[model samples]
Target: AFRPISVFREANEDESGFTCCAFSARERFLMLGTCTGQLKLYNVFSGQEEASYNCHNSAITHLEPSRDGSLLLTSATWSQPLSALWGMKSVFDMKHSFTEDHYVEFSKHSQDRVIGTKGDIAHIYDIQTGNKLLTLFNPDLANNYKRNCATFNPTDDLVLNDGVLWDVRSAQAIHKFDKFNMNISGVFHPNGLEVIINTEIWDLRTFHLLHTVPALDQCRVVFNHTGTVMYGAMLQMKSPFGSSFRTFNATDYKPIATIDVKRNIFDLCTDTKDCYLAVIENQGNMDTVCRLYEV
Candidate 1:
């Protein structure tokens, strides 16, 4: 709905663009992943590049900081499909690396454990030691599909995929929603009693659909720490110019605001307190840039 307070741009010109981004635990710094295999950190207040790392040789597909700000997790596309953990200190150093073909997520409840998805398998590991704890294999997954994401429920050990919920300890699916109408991604409500299946938010306790929105492609939703406000970006593939970002009331899924970026969004994230929302815009020949807006 409003423009960013500050804009940050990459130093070099690379057409591949930035793949993803994240905010530090305290919202003092921003973490970014580039298509050219670079991990960069920026000071939020000063808007300066503080540090960088050559984390991968291929494009970084995912990046996130630990809840405590002690570590960072990153993943790249192709080139072995690995994920690495870095220690955040004087310099962001590589602490551990693990084989995760796609996304890497730290548990919201347990900081010591993480979940990674490769193809149809979801692997759980120890954050500090990189020890494999469990492997969840979904037999229903199509052979051609890649597991793009895997996340933990905030209040429990349940993991949600496109339309199914799994018990992390047993690696067993405890619930599966209707598959015919399912999309490739979903998020659980902070209260843990509901889940958003694609664009439609559902109340798991009653097995009732609460609201439905437009179909979202390559969308990632973020909630304020209090779980009251939500924000996300939709890749408008049909739009010749770019995409739009939206804000919603988390309680009722009511649309609150909408902003047009006029460029494809590479990633979207929020500061710890939701004081700001960060957006990475892919501008093709003009170069990619990240913008932060007051929430």
Candidate 2:
């Protein structure tokens, strides 16, 4: 297991580490992709700065480090926007490139196709030629309307939109679950196509509607942490604050344990492996605080 130590105020004095991803398998190396187009690397165990690189000309939207810790993929929303992949070992050179001006709000890589989001359209491109392979539009409501977020499971190629599973190979819609209560965040669990959705109000289990756990009702479910167990932030609505986090037993959804933020956690983001958590304090400031936790 791996964890992170915050370097927001200490590393850059910016106090805002917008987003981060890890390269090493055990996450010994943390790659922080910031809103300012800066990629800061740090010691996962110590909160010490290791390296920093310019990732994009503008905001870096999403980041994913390759499984072998050999490559780092990153994307953004600026002009002539491109998703950049940097080599981690050979040269340690910071390299960023992409297909075209098509914006990539979400991206995942493979040896051939780099499945990604291009303004609500799911685009699959030949990594070498920048040639378009497939374009999926059936599940997108905002094609050409605005930025869209989508993800491809590296191990399974399961496509997801805001955590809702969609058939990328067929461009077909799967079971759709409404996030009526909170801010929507989701992930395709490591095990399979089963999707775990986290909203600002409720964390939902979806294979279908009725299969849901009763306790998930009316709670803001922010970022979900995936592992042998499932962990995520459960934000509650009340005066000054009533938000915290918990982990559920994977087999029964039984309460396993809770994450003690000891503060009102308004928002959070946990990686696929459940190693690190990006915690947001409150509306006082949208700035998110970063931490590393494993359940």
Candidate 3:
């Protein structure tokens, strides 16, 4: 179970249009991306804005941080169409820029490779060489959200939806997970064996389907920062809380805990220290609250 630790408000420029967030600076700082094209870094304990910037002309859709909190990767929407790499050393300056689509993430530890998507296609780019490495096509992509989910397992193999797994060095299909619409995207468990595709977990090592968590139909499941836990955010519900979330043990896919946000969650994340779950609640009318829960 998790209990509330802190709530940061914009009561102090900021009705807060926060779209996404990531914990960084060794969990000492929190990074927030807003629909108003604002990027902000905050002190988690003091609830103070450490620094802020307008990195894009449109909403910042994704805010991803490196393992060591030394780098920050961010992406804005199609109309803006940009991805920026930031080196967070006091200055937290934007180090590199990619003329790419909205959803982007560091390959691993903010290494030389990066992954991103455009509509139904996911592409990989080499940060060191500045050359496009690979592109995986999602033919049956059902994307009313206009973003594609493409991820890389620890083996460097790229996995995208309609459940196709491709070798990074070549375009050949190495594994076909399943032919279905991955409405959002999928995540590879840190151990690199099991993959959470939508609501079901698949063991890639044996080519067998794992447990499909009950009542998780058409929802998102993500791994904790250390992959020690799994979280599922279901679609809008009729209950007083607009949405609900369930946590599972990452190893055996066992139910651990559950929580409901005020309305719905625009983004959910955790402190690198694995001590808290940060839920960004969307209360409508551009009022968003960043609630931290101690796990």
Model number with the top lDDT: 1
Q: Is candidate 1 or candidate 2 better by lDDT?
A: 1
Report clashes for each candidate as comma-separated counts: 0, 8, 0
By lDDT: ranked, best first: 1, 3, 2
What are the lDDT figures for the candidates, one per model? 0.72, 0.52, 0.70
Where is model 2 more than 4 Å wrong at Cα? 1-18, 77-83, 92-112, 139-148, 153-158, 162-186, 197-210, 213-226, 234-243, 260-289, 293-295
Per residue, candidate 2 scores C-alpha lDDT tens digits across 1-295 of 3243453322655456444344455456556666567777766567677877776776565566665566667775573456766777866664445655233322333455566665555666654465666776654432232323565664535566543456666666564455543433345545453555542122234355323554544343333443456555543432122456666665556767665656565334455566566544432243444465542
lDDT of 2: 0.52
**What lDDT does candidate 3 reach at residue 219?**
62
lDDT of 1 by residue, 129-155 (tens): 888888776667432223336678996
In terms of lDDT, the poorest run of 10 residues in model 1 is: 234-243
Residue 80 of model 3 has an lDDT of 49
How does each model score on TM-score? 0.87, 0.64, 0.87
Model 3 reaches what TM-score against the true structure?
A: 0.87
Write the candidate numbers in order of decreasing TM-score.
1, 3, 2
User: How close to the true structure is residue 46 of candidate 1, measured as C-alpha lDDT?
Assistant: 79
